[PDB]
Design a protein around this ligand. Structure first.
Ligand SMILES: CC(=O)N[C@H]1[C@@H](O)[C@H](O)[C@@H](CO)O[C@@H]1O
Ligand SMILES: CC(=O)N[C@H]1[C@@H](O)[C@H](O)[C@@H](CO)O[C@@H]1O
Lengths: 285, 285
């Protein structure tokens, strides 16, 4: 049995996984604020809880986490403000008395590797962008490798497209909290729950549609820059919002052409086929 | 003896090169408009001229060219408007009765490879951006490869940052023709020659300075997107303008921080040490 743990700003998910990739004992808790209740403390108790439940000695532990991960060190070496005080968090050191077999990866690295372990694709070059609390990226290159860059922060695509006159990055315009502000800013008051926004647009609510289009325009703009850099065979959209599937793609994919030359052929854009668990599988790779 | 030919929008450069990388018989002609005088005709006669001069049978011919290059086909498979009617140009077919040993690479691929053959760098990941007629890119990754993407158009960074309200791409704001327009638009007195603009700014010309800064702002904005995607160890600026050296860098490098978070560490930005000839060496690599 392997222990998998996926750390986001909103939730920590975890599971025990066996050799055949079967998931047991899936758990999902609210992420501690990391001020008075610490993420490391919760991760440690998640691990010890599985070790106690299953009488595990030195379990192989995979950690997927938001933030820039130095994978060799097992450490958060750079972190946006979604998780405060997160830089310097070293999960290998944290867990060393429980196990010497700890891997740590960025959450999008894990999502992509998990997606690719569960689903085959023809494309040789696959970029994954997650839309959720944050926006993150990972790129599986031609030779099968996911490179994290010289300082491990490659594909932090949330930092794309900083607009000086608006003081926003890509992530500050397209992340869940930004979309929720756009909803209330755009007069959508039925709810503040993103799925309801999509449901309203599907049943022909013009305010839901205008908010979604204006948001998908900014999302498409970010995808276009990834496209231009990488020219990938495939762009996967993951994260919580990926549950919309084609109802999400239909807003974003046509708009990518707005930021590309008229004759420029860009990669197909699809949601991840595994919606929730991709990172739990990927963090063991 | 190898034949090297480097095709830009403005100039075609060529030379004969021997095993020790000594360059002989360097030539430089104005690039035909590719309307009534054809680039292929000039390349063919450049090759036959070298073949006769040196009595070369089936010479190895390296071709470096602006445009998206399918290296295996030896073909321009996509070309922006800097060179008209260029899509479909196949240099292997063009030269097949002269030689079966023809290589074709994108001009920035060749510039980077030539640069790296002449100069060693600490960085493992090196991005090269050329500023000139067009703007182009190439990235030597961790494992030493330069990947051209799924459809060979990776790192065509001139298409970055399309602004719908201005109808401009990165290249349409930062390429030479754009800088000259900015010079004329900005009231600049002395000339419309980019070297003169830099000389004027060095001699305390406030209009030259303002034009350079506003343009360097747009260049830095593009460099920042490359930085965010790749997190490279080094960003080389090539093209004719690289001969300005630190007088170019000093305008562009500090401004890259404007499009990145306050604590974000970006790569050193340097000009290529090879100023004119990098691509002639690179197209044989
Ligand atoms: C700390 C940080 O910069 N996190 C990014 C990235 O690391 C995550 O992968 C992405 C998804 O959560 O958005 C996050 O904003
Ligand atoms: C035909 C085309 O689109 N060329 C790009 C790119 O291929 C070149 O590498 C770059 C440098 O000349 O500018 C060019 O604009």
């Amino acid at each position: 049995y392997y222990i998998a743990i996926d750390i986001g700003g909103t939730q920590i998910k975890s599971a025990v996984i066996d050799k055949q990739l079967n998931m047991f004992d899936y758990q999902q808790i609210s992420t501690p604020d990391n001020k008075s209740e610490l993420i490391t403390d919760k991760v440690y108790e998640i691990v010890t809880g599985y070790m106690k439940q299953y009488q595990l000695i030195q379990p192989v532990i995979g950690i997927s986490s938001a933030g820039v991960v130095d994978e060799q060190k097992g450490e958060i070496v750079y972190a946006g403000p979604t998780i405060p005080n997160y830089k310097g968090t070293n999960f290998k050191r944290l867990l060393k008395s429980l196990s010497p077999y700890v891997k740590v990866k960025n959450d999008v690295n894990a999502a992509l590797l998990g997606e690719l372990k569960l689903h085959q694709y023809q494309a040789e070059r696959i970029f994954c962008m997650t839309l959720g609390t944050g926006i993150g990226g990972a790129y599986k290159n031609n030779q099968g490798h996911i490179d994290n860059g010289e300082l491990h922060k490659a594909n932090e695509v949330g930092y794309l497209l900083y607009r000086p006159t608006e003081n926003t990055t890509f992530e500050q315009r397209a992340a869940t909290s930004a979309l929720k502000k756009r909803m209330i800013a755009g007069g959508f008051t039925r709810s503040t729950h993103v799925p309801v926004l999509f449901e309203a647009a599907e049943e022909g609510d013009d305010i839901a549609k205008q908010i979604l289009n204006e948001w998908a325009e900014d999302v498409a703009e970010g995808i276009a820059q990834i496209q231009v850099m990488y020219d990938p065979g495939l762009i996967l959209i993951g994260g919580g919002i990926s549950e919309q599937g084609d109802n999400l793609i239909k807003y974003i994919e046509p708009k990518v052409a707005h930021y590309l030359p008229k004759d420029y052929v860009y990669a197909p854009i699809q949601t991840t086929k595994s919606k929730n668990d991709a990172a739990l599988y990927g963090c063991l790779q």
